[PDB]
Amino acid sequence: SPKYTKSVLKKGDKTNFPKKGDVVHCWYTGTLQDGTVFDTNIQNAKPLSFKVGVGKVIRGWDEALLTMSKGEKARLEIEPEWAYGKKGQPDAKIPPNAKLTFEVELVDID
Amino acid sequence: SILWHEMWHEGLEEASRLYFGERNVKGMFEVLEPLHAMMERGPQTLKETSFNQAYGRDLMEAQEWCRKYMKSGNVKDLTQAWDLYYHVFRRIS
Numbered sequence: 720s721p722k723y724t725k726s727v728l729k730k731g732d733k734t735n736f737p738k739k740g741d742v743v744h745c746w747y748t749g750t751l752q753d754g755t756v757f758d759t760n761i762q763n764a765k766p767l768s769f770k771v772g773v774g775k776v777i778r779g780w781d782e783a784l785l786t787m788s789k790g791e792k793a794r795l796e797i798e799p800e801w802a803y804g805k806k807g808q809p810d811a812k813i814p815p816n817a818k819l820t821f822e823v824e825l826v827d828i829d
Numbered sequence: 830s831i832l833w834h835e836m837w838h839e840g841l842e843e844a845s846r847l848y849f850g851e852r853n854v855k856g857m858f859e860v861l862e863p864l865h866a867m868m869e870r871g872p873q874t875l876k877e878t879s880f881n882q883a884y885g886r887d888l889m890e891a892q893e894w895c896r897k898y899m900k901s902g903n904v905k906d907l908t909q910a911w912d913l914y915y916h917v918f919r920r921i922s
């Protein structure tokens with residue numbers, strides 16, 4: 720009943736997983752169905768950091784990160800209900816009811 | 830608060846809630862405008878001066894990218910603006 724699927728591209732250390740309230744640091748690339756890259760923070764560049772499990776990011780990320788170990792690179796396919804839903808994010812070229820694909824690399828856990 | 834780091838920390842977070850959460854760019858600008866105006870009045874204390882030295886350039890450039898975005902609609906401009914606001918937010922914690 721999660722509304723995302725995860726495919727592991729590179730394994731993490733299988734030991735250190737983010738917990739609710741931890742700050743995580745990530746590299747990512749986000750794509751639409753046709754492979755359009757709507758954003759990447761991969762090159763001044765530095766990892767995205769946020770406190771996990773408290774709604775700082777879309778639900779698909781908030782839930783998926785708890786299942787990744789440090790160093791893991793994974794492909795996430797997130798259903799619109801756990802991303803931007805009916806409204807989408809027009810300014811960022813995300814349409815209504817869009818399934819989002821992210822490659823996410825978990826670099827560190829504070 | 831009258832501390833610039835606290836005023837900007839609260840303002841950036843609220844501005845981002847209004848923009849990303851509420852999809853409310855008008856509201857976002859109403860929160861940011863006073864803070865940028867404060868910067869344009871200039872620092873008046875030791876701590877305001879130190880804050881301006883550290884973050885003043887990044888904050889003014891964020892505003893410039895945002896103004897560029899409001900005429901271009903180009904996501905590149907939007908993202909450069911928020912990258913700078915995010916940077917300042919994280920550095921002041």
Ligand SMILES: CO[C@H]1C[C@@H]2CC[C@@H](C)[C@@](O)(O2)C(=O)C(=O)N2CCCC[C@H]2C(=O)O[C@H]([C@H](C)C[C@@H]2CC[C@@H](O)[C@H](OC)C2)CC(=O)[C@H](C)/C=C(\C)[C@@H](O)[C@@H](OC)C(=O)[C@H](C)C[C@H](C)/C=C/C=C/C=C/1C
Nearest residue numbers: 749758774775776777811841845846849850911912915918
């Ligand atoms: C320059 O690039 C943008 C990110 C872009 C925006 C557009 C989207 C396509 C995208 O390209 O990211 C993207 O790829 C995406 O969908 N992302 C980013 C990577 C994590 C997954 C997802 C996301 O949730 O973004 C997030 C999504 C867009 C909005 C949030 C979704 C969850 C929802 O509950 C929140 O409601 C509030 C809003 C954006 C973020 O990851 C940033 C870090 C977090 C926030 C803005 C909020 O948590 C905010 O809450 C008030 C904060 O507490 C922050 C820390 C306050 C500071 C001052 C603001 C920093 C702003 C940083 C902005 C950044 C880096």
